Amino acid sequence: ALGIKSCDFQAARNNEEHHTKALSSRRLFVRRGQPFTIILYFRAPVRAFLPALKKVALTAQTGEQPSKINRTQATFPISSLGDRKWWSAVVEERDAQSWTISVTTPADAVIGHYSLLLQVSGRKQLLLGQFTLLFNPWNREDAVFLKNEAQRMEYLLNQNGLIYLGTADCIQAESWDFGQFEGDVIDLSLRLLSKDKQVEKWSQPVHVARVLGALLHFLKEQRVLPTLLNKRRGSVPILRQWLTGRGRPVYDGQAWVLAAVACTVLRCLGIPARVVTTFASAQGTGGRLLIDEYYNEEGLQNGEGQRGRIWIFQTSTECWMTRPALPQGYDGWQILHPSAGSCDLVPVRAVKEGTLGLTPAVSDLFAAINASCVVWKCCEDGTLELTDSNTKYVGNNISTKGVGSDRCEDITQNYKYPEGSLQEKEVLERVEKEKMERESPLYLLLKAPSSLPLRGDAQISVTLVNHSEQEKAVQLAIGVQAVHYNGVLAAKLWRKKLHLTLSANLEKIITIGLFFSNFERNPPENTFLRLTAMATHSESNLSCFAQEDIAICRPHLAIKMPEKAEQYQPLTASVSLQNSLDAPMEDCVISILGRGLIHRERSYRFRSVWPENTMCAKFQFTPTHVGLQRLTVEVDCNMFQNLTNYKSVTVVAPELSA
């Protein structure tokens, strides 16, 4: 006399309570360690409540072979005596025909797809429905607990991210759609995680993060192709293409998207994560704190590059969890570091303090932001001369998106002590000691702007100081080369040879104009400018050298849009672009998109823009989703492609009326 009619999982209200409403309003997504409510409906009225309560039990199973030993299967009764810190169920409200049941899960529960089954005494198992269990940054007892609500909103609930690219002195923020709450992202992440057979460890955020980082790095190596090809629409299409093989592939000039894809997967599973960009990262050293750079007598580089290079930038995924298996004090931000393979979780503090030995990857991450650069001159005779070079600092302007804003947050102090400080000296000598136990008359100063306008003009200054008592015959070589983001040589653009005489004890300033029209070829897209100066005098056998990385600056895309907008009302955004180039802009396409504002994307064609003129396109659209939304605008033409800017708009609910 206890037959079940139906079970209402109340996906809308529970998903609102569990901060999973962006995932679905129909499927039940719950975070572990927090109660959720279901309604049980009976075919016939229940006469006596207490015996009926004694006659029912609930069962939760995950995976294909659930077992009590794996913690993948749990059986619990429905009573007020249940353990609220474990699997439990209590009837909170009841009618004659229905029970309102509050179900809890342990804060250390195995994540994934679950089935809820009801056991009536002397009857066969009845499936009540399906739900998906996630990590809970809102639960104090969870390993991924986050103290701040703002940090939870930024690192788990926000799908509108910013990946910082460019150079250290010219940081360009690219709008990124993480899209962790897209419909299939949770299913794709769990399917990828299912390639790991230690399902009992899926309760541990460290294990899940390591497994997913390794698998995603393997997929990135398998699917990213050697070199529109650079047009991006966030992490979700990349993840779909990596897992299914269908869609637009990613090419090696944008291999930095691995960090964003990992951030999306971790955020969708409930692990707080952020994308971190390190500028001037010394990659490929194996922990060695030295970088060898080789330049010819024209100040240019010949081959494709070395194995150990200083990248213009490198992206990485940081994730938030405790470290129970580590010595105390390493809870917080962890760096995902795949090793060609296996992935490692490195606390940021361990990198900062040089705690080489805590995890296997501490040495590589420490070398990435602490190596020194040694510059060699390759003479035409073949002999390799050492060079007196300016200091090339590594690990600059370590940046991530700020909390509760579109501003940029600098987090370099989490990774390094200030240069020349006592603490940095202590860390460096300790690391040197561990590794050792285990195993000129001329001064050049190069002044360059941080950016060069696209097809534009800039001025550079070389200051040469002669400290000899005699005048010097000095050959000054100036070179401009295009380099990819990962330090791979792209194209030789400009070379200039000067012959100067420096009076004794006299400083001389040489101003040189750096013009695009002087370049032997146009720099390839998404490349940076390596500017080098090389001063050689007589037969001193030593050359002064300085280098600077220059970003190519494109015209500013200005978006004008009201700060607030009413839901279900038309909203106009005007977009302007000034043609500051030396040619007309032809084949002009402008696209607008943004989740909660525009369904997918709309592409428009606008008229050709002559030099020194301005475009002014107005777009009208009606926002339909309440919240903090972002409009993303992309401009394509024959001079430049994938020029993206963004603007945030807060959409408010309509005023209440009758």
User: Which residues span the domain enclosing 99?
Assistant: 4-134
Residue 441 DSSP label: -
3-state secondary structure 261-327: HHHHHHHHHCCCEEEEEEEEEEECCCCCCEEEEEEECCCCCCCCCCCCEEEEEEEEEEEEECCCCCC
Q: CA 41, CA 393: separation in Å to the nearest integer?
A: 67
Q: CA 606, CA 589: separation in Å to the nearest integer?
A: 6
Q: How far is CA 444 from the centre of its chain?
A: 38
Residue 518 DSSP label: G
Residue 151 class from Cβ within 10 Å (0-12 exposed, 13-18 middle, 19+ buried)?
A: middle
The answer to whether 88 and 103 are in contact (CB under 8 A) is yes
Q: CA 414, CA 276: separation in Å to the nearest integer?
A: 12
The answer to whether 546 and 479 are in contact (CB under 8 A) is no
Q: CA 104, CA 35: separation in Å to the nearest integer?
A: 4
Within this chain, do residues 368 and 249 fall inside the same structural domain, yes or no?
Answer: yes
Edge to edge, what strands does the sheet with 384-386 contain? 290-296, 372-378, 384-386
Residue 223 class from Cβ within 10 Å (0-12 exposed, 13-18 middle, 19+ buried)?
A: middle
Cross-strand partners of 444:
464
Phi, psi of 535 (to 5 degrees): -115, 120
Q: CA 221, CA 335: separation in Å to the nearest integer?
A: 19
Q: CA 96, CA 44: separation in Å to the nearest integer?
A: 8
Q: Give the Cβ contact number of residue 549 at 10 Å.
A: 23
- Bin 530: left if φ > 0, else alpha if -120 < ψ < 50, else beta: beta
Residue 251 DSSP label: B
Within this chain, do residues 243 and 324 fall inside the same structural domain, yes or no?
Answer: yes
Q: CA 394, CA 374: separation in Å to the nearest integer?
A: 12
In 3D space, the residue among 348, 353, 317, 354 whose CA is nearest the CA of residue 331 turns out to be 348
- Torsion over CA: 483, 219, 246, 233 (sign): negative
Within this chain, do residues 405 and 468 fall inside the same structural domain, yes or no?
Answer: no
Cross-strand partners of 251:
225
Q: Which residues contact 119 (CB under 8 A, 6 or more apart)?
A: 56, 57, 58, 59, 75, 125, 126
Residue 59 forms part of a structural domain? yes
> Domain tally for the chain?
4
Cross-strand partners of 277:
315, 399
In 3D space, the residue among 286, 308, 258, 272 whose CA is nearest the CA of residue 486 turns out to be 308
Q: What is the dihedral of CA 304, 307, 308, 312, to 10 degrees?
A: 40
Residue 17 forms part of a structural domain? yes
Instruction: Using the 3D structure, point to which of 488, 519, 553 is the last residue of a domain.
Output: 553
Instruction: Using the 3D structure, point to which of 527, 553, 579 is the last residue of a domain.
Output: 553
Residue 613 forms part of a structural domain? yes
Q: CA 576, CA 338: separation in Å to the nearest integer?
A: 42
Gap positions in the chain, given as the residue before each gap (C–N > 2.5 A)? 227, 340, 439
Q: CA 488, CA 545: separation in Å to the nearest integer?
A: 20
The answer to whether 227 and 253 are in contact (CB under 8 A) is yes
N- to C-terminal Cα distance for the chain? 47
Q: Give the Cβ contact number of residue 92 at 10 Å.
A: 12
Q: CA 318, CA 151: separation in Å to the nearest integer?
A: 13
Helix, strand, coil shares, percent, the chain, to 5: 20, 40, 40
Q: Give, for 547, the enclosing helix (H) or strand (E).
A: strand 544-553
CATH number of domain containing 644? 2.60.40.10
Within this chain, do residues 225 and 335 fall inside the same structural domain, yes or no?
Answer: yes
Q: What is the dihedral of CA 583, 584, 586, 591, to 10 degrees?
A: 100
Within this chain, do residues 515 and 627 fall inside the same structural domain, yes or no?
Answer: no
Residue 371 forms part of a structural domain? yes
Q: Give the Cβ contact number of residue 320 at 10 Å.
A: 24
Residue 414 forms part of a structural domain? yes
Within this chain, do residues 55 and 204 fall inside the same structural domain, yes or no?
Answer: no
The answer to whether 135 and 111 are in contact (CB under 8 A) is yes
Instruction: Using the 3D structure, point to which of 106, 134, 162 is the last residue of a domain.
Output: 134
Q: CA 323, CA 371: separation in Å to the nearest integer?
A: 28
Phi, psi of 149 (to 5 degrees): -70, -35
Cross-strand partners of 127:
117
The answer to whether 285 and 311 are in contact (CB under 8 A) is no
Residue 537 forms part of a structural domain? yes
Token code pair at residue 534: 């090389």
Give the CA distances from residue 484 to residues 260, 309, 523, in Å, rounded to whole numbers and listed in that order. 19, 11, 10
Phi, psi of 92 (to 5 degrees): -90, -45
> Using DSSP, how many helices (H) and how many strands (E) does the chain show?
11, 37
Q: CA 183, CA 25: separation in Å to the nearest integer?
A: 11
Within this chain, do residues 390 and 521 fall inside the same structural domain, yes or no?
Answer: no
Cross-strand partners of 513:
459
In 3D space, the residue among 228, 241, 235 whose CA is nearest the CA of residue 603 turns out to be 228
**5-12 — which CB contacts under 8 Å span 24+ positions?**
5/41, 5/42, 5/43, 6/41, 7/38, 7/39, 7/40, 7/41, 7/116, 7/118, 7/128, 7/129, 8/38, 8/39, 8/41, 9/38, 9/128, 9/129, 9/131, 10/36, 10/37, 10/38, 10/39
In 3D space, the residue among 523, 521, 543, 317 whose CA is nearest the CA of residue 442 turns out to be 543
Within this chain, do residues 492 and 530 fall inside the same structural domain, yes or no?
Answer: yes
Edge to edge, what strands does the sheet with 396-401 contain? 342-347, 332-339, 309-321, 273-283, 396-401, 408-410
Token code pair at residue 108: 């250390």
DSSP three-state, residue 407: coil
- Give the resolution in Å: 2.5
Within this chain, do residues 371 and 416 fall inside the same structural domain, yes or no?
Answer: yes
Residue 648 forms part of a structural domain? yes
Within this chain, do residues 382 and 451 fall inside the same structural domain, yes or no?
Answer: no
Q: What is the dihedral of CA 510, 514, 520, 525, to 10 degrees?
A: 140
Within this chain, do residues 505 and 577 fall inside the same structural domain, yes or no?
Answer: no
The answer to whether 492 and 534 are in contact (CB under 8 A) is no
Within this chain, do residues 432 and 457 fall inside the same structural domain, yes or no?
Answer: no
CATH number of domain containing 387? 3.90.260.10
Q: What is the dihedral of CA 316, 317, 322, 323, to 10 degrees?
A: -50
Q: Cα angle at 105 between 102 and 107, to 5 degrees?
A: 135
Q: CA 166, CA 483: separation in Å to the nearest integer?
A: 12
Residue 140 forms part of a structural domain? no
Phi, psi of 413 (to 5 degrees): -65, -20
Token code pair at residue 277: 């960009």
The answer to whether 109 and 203 are in contact (CB under 8 A) is yes
